[PDB]
DNA sequence: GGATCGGCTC
DNA sequence: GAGCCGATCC
């Protein structure tokens, strides 16, 4: 069609998108990305330790896709 | 570590 | 007013 879904969720990870119930921000967005074993991160310094205590140091803290336009 | 709400900057 | 990050509770 007109938009397509290129390059935007990495394989092995999961994404979650929910709206926050009512606040001083009511209305707001709020996501994040939960690591293939199920481990919910919403930081870049915990998502550091993650990787490296893996030992696997390969993904980035840039890797992390939370844009919704896609890239 | 996990889940939910509010504070600060532009 | 709008957008993004942090603080609080368990």
Redesign the pocket.
């Known amino acids: 069609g007109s938009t397509e879904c290129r390059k935007s969720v990495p394989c092995g990870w999961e994404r979650v998108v929910?709206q926050?119930?009512?606040?001083?921000?009511?209305?707001?967005?709020?996501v994040y990305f939960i690591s293939p074993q199920?481990?919910?991160?919403?930081?870049?310094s915990?998502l550091a330790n993650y990787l490296h205590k893996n030992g696997e140091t390969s993904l980035k803290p840039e890797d992390f896709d939370?844009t919704v336009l896609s890239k």
Do not use: E, H, V, W
């Open positions: 929910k926050r119930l009512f606040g001083k921000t009511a209305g707001r967005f709020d199920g481990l919910k991160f919403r930081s870049k915990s939370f």
